[PDB]
Predict the structure.
Amino acid sequence: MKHGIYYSYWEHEWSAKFGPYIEKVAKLGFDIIEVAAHHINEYSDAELATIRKSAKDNGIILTAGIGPSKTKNLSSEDAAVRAAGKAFFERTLSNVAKLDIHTIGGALHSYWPIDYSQPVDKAGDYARGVEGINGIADFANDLGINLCIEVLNRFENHVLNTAAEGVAFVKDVGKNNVKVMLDTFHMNIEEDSFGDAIRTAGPLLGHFHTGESNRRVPGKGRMPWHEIGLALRDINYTGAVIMEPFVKTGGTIGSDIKVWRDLSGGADIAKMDEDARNALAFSRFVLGG
Amino acid sequence: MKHGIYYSYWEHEWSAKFGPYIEKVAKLGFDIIEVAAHHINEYSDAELATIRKSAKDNGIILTAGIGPSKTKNLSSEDAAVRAAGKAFFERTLSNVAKLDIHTIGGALHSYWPIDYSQPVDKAGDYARGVEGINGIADFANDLGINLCIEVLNRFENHVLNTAAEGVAFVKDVGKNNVKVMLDTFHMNIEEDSFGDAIRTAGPLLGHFHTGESNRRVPGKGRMPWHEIGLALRDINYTGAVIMEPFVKTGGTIGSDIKVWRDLSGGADIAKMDEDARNALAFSRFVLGG
Amino acid sequence: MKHGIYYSYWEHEWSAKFGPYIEKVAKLGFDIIEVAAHHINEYSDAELATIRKSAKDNGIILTAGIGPSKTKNLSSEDAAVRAAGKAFFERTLSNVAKLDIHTIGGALHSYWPIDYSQPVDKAGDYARGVEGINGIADFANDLGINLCIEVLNRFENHVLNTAAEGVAFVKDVGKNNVKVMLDTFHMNIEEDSFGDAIRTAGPLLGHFHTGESNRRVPGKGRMPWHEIGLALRDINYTGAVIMEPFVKTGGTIGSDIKVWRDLSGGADIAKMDEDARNALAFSRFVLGG
Amino acid sequence: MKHGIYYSYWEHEWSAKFGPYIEKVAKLGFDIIEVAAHHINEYSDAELATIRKSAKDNGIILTAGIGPSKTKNLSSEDAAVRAAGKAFFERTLSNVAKLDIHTIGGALHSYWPIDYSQPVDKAGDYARGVEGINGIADFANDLGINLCIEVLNRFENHVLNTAAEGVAFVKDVGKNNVKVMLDTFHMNIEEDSFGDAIRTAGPLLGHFHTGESNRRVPGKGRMPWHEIGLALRDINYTGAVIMEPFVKTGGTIGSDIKVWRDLSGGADIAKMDEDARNALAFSRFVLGG
Ligand SMILES: O=C(CO)[C@@H](O)[C@H](O)[C@H](O)CO
Ligand SMILES: O=C(CO)[C@@H](O)[C@H](O)[C@H](O)CO
Ligand SMILES: O=C(CO)[C@@H](O)[C@H](O)[C@H](O)CO
Ligand SMILES: O=C(CO)[C@@H](O)[C@H](O)[C@H](O)CO
Ligand SMILES: [Mn+2]
Ligand SMILES: [Mn+2]
Ligand SMILES: [Mn+2]
Ligand SMILES: [Mn+2]
């Protein structure tokens, strides 16, 4: 079981480049650094070479998250959008492989952030989503990549909200490299039980995100970490545990994650790194590995 | 300390009339039935008189909720909207008084649902909301009505997300009949601690909403009820404790509250009542009253 | 899944007869009333049939708890004592069957109270305990009785302190009608996790005791009832859930259970019954049944 | 706020010399090492000075725990025992002062381990304990030592089992250098709420002991660490937080603490050290320091 952090924790814009963070994160002690995959597409093969090398040199693994856009996704009833989504995913999957990344996670079956101004079609999105993910599974698999379908709360997704729904969705896809993904922030809202949600995912759990109920780093809040660690161990989980804290207001990140107030205690960068380091030590000790 | 339930618990649409629930809810054992304040505005004086007498004859109190619309919100940058908002409230409070209602709660400082498609101005909406609520406090006061400002999670309000922020707002208002209102559903997401949140509201807590993290009736989930009851008693809360369960998909209520899966276990009305009745017994036993 | 209560909740002495309690408890709404075997050996075959009749008439099931004495225990190093123990057990079991009782629980593998003034022989006591219980299993099974071995905290027993140890012991016994028994008060001290302890017992869980960490009626405290309820349902527990609260000081019970302060809140019999009725409602709602 | 550990963690006898641990514990990162006042009165003035200098050179603070014997306690009915007890405390206090220890804690009001072999007199022992502590308070105060009265579970003490009882005791003593002492292991059994208990102790909280419900190092279990940390902060606790784990079977320690099974995971010293070190980082991060 390896631990990582989403570099966006230190930024305010989703577009900020992660290159510099590879070494920073490694020095903080993390086994993994999770990055935003759409960025991977704007880099030349040489720049990607730098990155892959920077990671191996600093002894750290990269993992990526993907938030499909409304115009390029797999669940849309609009066939052109679905085609754009398929074309976009295959390209990204290819570039992700250049960085030796083997896990892609996020709302891959849909798009994020979701737009509720217009009515929503859950059954239809569910059905198209399954076809869509099934359609790119082999491609990802050939690049040795797992596609992890993240379960989100009602405000961020209307198709998969509980581990049970995520598991059903993964079984319909019927691919060995497609897995369920849970996030404590989301479970805290939707799940009847943390331990049960994790046990429900079981062998299908392929990626894991952590944070307190208001997205502070692990260890700051009332989350049932002890129960969480026990259940992760019950299902012999050896995948990644990525903390995804969002404690700074402002920018596209602040409005997209809806961080309306500062939750870092007005922390400077040194304090940010400290909380991360402490959260890491906390997660290793309470969760495992 | 008195217990009540939001009648829309039994409905799929906001447009369902509450009149018939007066006796139903009273016979289930509740002390209060909470009702939507917009519905009151659609009744004739005679129907209102009928309703007022029905509540009286059934030994049950009426409490009300208000969700200002984008067209009537006291915090809008557009002075015209603010004026409409003021007119809307005065009108509503008058009608609310015809039913002998002394408690109005909800996001009175803003609008709901909210639209995050346009940038948000927190400091601006905050300042405007304070003046706007201050501006209608006396009017409401002359009617014997307390205005309880509800603290909501980040996905439903961008100004007041915490008990601390709620207290600060009520203070800047500086009115005796303007209070803070907390809701376990919202607290569960935003607060560092349930107990500290309730203690932080203290003498200012004027209204209270309950439900599990996914909105089922109190007692079905992992909410820290023991801790919540101890804190409510610790601040000597003698206000209302209103369970606000939303376990049914479909309808306007389903889409607005984002109930994308059935959380009632396929409950018929009889099951619905039993759950409400058991949650009621639970709440009296664990929370007080 | 059925609910009961240990009648001594109302007494101060172990030597209090439970006959009158059959109707009182049935009328309070419990499906079961747990009684003390100590007494059962005293009543005549005639008085016994009267009790059996009273329970059938009030439609209530009886369950029994046994606290073997140090002069009559199956784990004794002394062979004379082990023989008295087996004789004491067959005799008791014969009488228990006259009351139509099918479940006996307690520290059947040892003796209670217990005496730590002398050195302890853990391995020896565990070993004889297995042989001893194995020695009487069939006799009990012929009578349709399950022997539930209760796991207790370190202050009350030195052999079986966890569900894992309880299960290990039940397996070394190798009898179908010998089961493991858990008690929330004891789990609260020794277990790493309530849910895991219950899952560890799984199919072997034959009887269950409930109470808050300090022995008040369930629902009065911080016990993880929601968690306990999920685990019980996960393992399809359909056995009995007996609350065993001890909130009164004085008498032998006060001394043996170490109730050094009142925890009833100066409750008179009527209050004691209200608390019992509420804890029952609570247990049925949160735990199931 | 400072952190420490009871050296007995690595031992099996209350009579193991602690001098060598001064350096080890300091190297592990602790601010404090808690010592047993067992030996102390047998060390020569020279030895004590060596120990004191060792603490200085290693920059660590010393604290002491005491367990009065049945023959030298202050609550005894026999006037001779109370006299020997007072003589014992003055002697111990003087030598503790030579090691520059300013905090003494334990069941100072009575004796440990308690013996329930014979009947118990709670009111009497209470009254005598109050006078006995009041009686040695000034002697301790001249040395600049605070006497912290430990609240223990029912199995270990019959007089003070609650934070409220301990606070009532300390008030009757009416001495500025006699405070209340809480221990999470003991609180886990007797208290209604961890936070309320800590809040109740308030400004009288002088010392604090930590461990999981079954006595493992802090962070290994389900203790409500977050709630506990918020409470200590609520009361501005700047005292010491001493983890007191007992995870090894065997010896006098093993039988007095009733450790009937290994809870260290068969840990060799290096692992014992890693666990302590990890519980330390954990405690500093969750509780503060
Ligand atoms: O949990 C979250 C935000 O709610 C992220 O994991 C997000 O889903 C990803 O960055 C894009 O899908
Ligand atoms: O908690 C909620 C729903 O999120 C309600 O109390 C709502 O805010 C009110 O009905 C309008 O303001
Ligand atoms: O839990 C308890 C008391 O600690 C009882 O169930 C007891 O064990 C039984 O009455 C005799 O074995
Ligand atoms: O809590 C404990 C063990 O139960 C210790 O602090 C003990 O009380 C002390 O060593 C003597 O009083
Ligand atoms: Mn996530
Ligand atoms: Mn609400
Ligand atoms: Mn029991
Ligand atoms: Mn202690």
Q: What stands out?
A: Residues 231 and 254 of chain D are 32 Å apart (CA to CA). The pocket of D-fructose (ligand 3) is lined by residues C 65, 67, 106-107, 112, 150, 152, 156, 183, 209, 244 (CB under 6 Å). Chain D has one domain: 2-289.
